[PDB]
């Protein structure tokens, strides 16, 4: 999955990082890796994964890390909300309730 | 997946922890993360995952941890059984046989 | 999945290594392990996985590793491109853009 490098950076995603993609439109859930893109606002699903989505679909991109007890206690997740143009609306360091 | 914080605590689930959800009604199996809820007895599936379940479905929520040999020998799993209202019926520290 | 040992070596795949197979023809995505093959250009899907592919299908074979921050900064992925006969066309140490 090619993600606008600036958007990826804000979400602390590194190139090659495995991420889980869940499609809100069709319910598909799959894993792939991040490719940093040079096109502003671009999110392009490549390869076999292209069959799991349709252009225009709304998706949630999740990145997980293996952490120990101390890391969990000090951890602050980076949650980025974007608009229809993939422009940043919000970036929080805590889950919503 | 939003889980009643008190129920989550009893199962030693931390907010943000990846868990596997398996639906007994429809057989769907998927992975998502825990969101601590403030509503008593509430278990709400959010986002794309909502398409994998129906309200009223019976599910099994599994949490795994990466352990070494010594940790495995000393490990005691926290198994929580609940009723139809998600009220605690039992909590054991060993598998059933 | 049995992979020509020479091809596997070029992609730094060790026997027994878990890999993710994604089929471009049918969109199937599954995980299995590597078996080193002695037949030149051979890629044979064995067991239950055989039902997820058809002979002749184009697939992408992915290998992931768990890395820390320092390892990520120094990491160079081994990306191998092959032709229709599974002969090596290219081997790069960086992602395409």
């Amino acid at each position: 999955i090619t993600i606008d490098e600036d958007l990826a950076k804000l979400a602390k995603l590194r190139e090659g990082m495995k991420v889980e993609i869940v499609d809100v439109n069709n319910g598909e859930r799959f894993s792939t890796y991040v490719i940093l893109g040079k096109k502003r606002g671009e999110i392009c699903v490549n390869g076999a994964a292209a069959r799991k989505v349709a252009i225009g679909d709304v998706v949630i991109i999740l990145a997980y890390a293996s952490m120990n007890e101390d890391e969990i206690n000090a951890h602050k997740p980076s949650i980025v909300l974007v608009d229809e143009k993939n422009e940043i609306l919000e970036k929080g360091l805590e889950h919503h309730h | 997946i939003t889980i009643d914080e008190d129920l989550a605590k009893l199962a030693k689930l931390r907010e943000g922890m990846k868990v596997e959800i398996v639906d007994v009604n429809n057989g769907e199996r998927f992975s998502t993360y825990v969101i601590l809820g403030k509503k008593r007895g509430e278990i709400c599936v959010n986002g794309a995952a909502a398409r994998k379940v129906a309200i009223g479905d019976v599910v099994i929520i599994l949490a795994y941890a990466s352990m070494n040999e010594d940790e495995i020998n000393a490990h005691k799993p926290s198994i929580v059984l609940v009723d139809e209202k998600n009220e605690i019926l039992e909590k054991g520290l060993e598998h059933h046989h | 999945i049995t992979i020509d040992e020479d091809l596997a070596k070029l992609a730094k795949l060790r026997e027994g290594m878990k890999v993710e197979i994604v089929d471009v023809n049918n969109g199937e995505r599954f995980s299995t392990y590597v078996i080193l093959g002695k037949k030149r250009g051979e890629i044979c899907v064995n067991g239950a996985a055989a039902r997820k592919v058809a002979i002749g299908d184009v697939v992408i074979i992915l290998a992931y590793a768990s890395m820390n921050e320092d390892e990520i900064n120094a990491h160079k992925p081994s990306i191998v491109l092959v032709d229709e006969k599974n002969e090596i066309l290219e081997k790069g140490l960086e992602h395409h853009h």
Partner: peptide, 24 residues
């Protein structure tokens, strides 16, 4: 002992393109 934890996420982004035969 370690656990997989949500590190970061991009919520409700829009797929702008798809390339089945993407090369490299």
């Amino acid at each position: 002992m370690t656990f997989e934890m949500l590190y970061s996420k991009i919520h409700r982004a829009t797929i702008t393109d798809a390339n089945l035969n993407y090369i490299g």
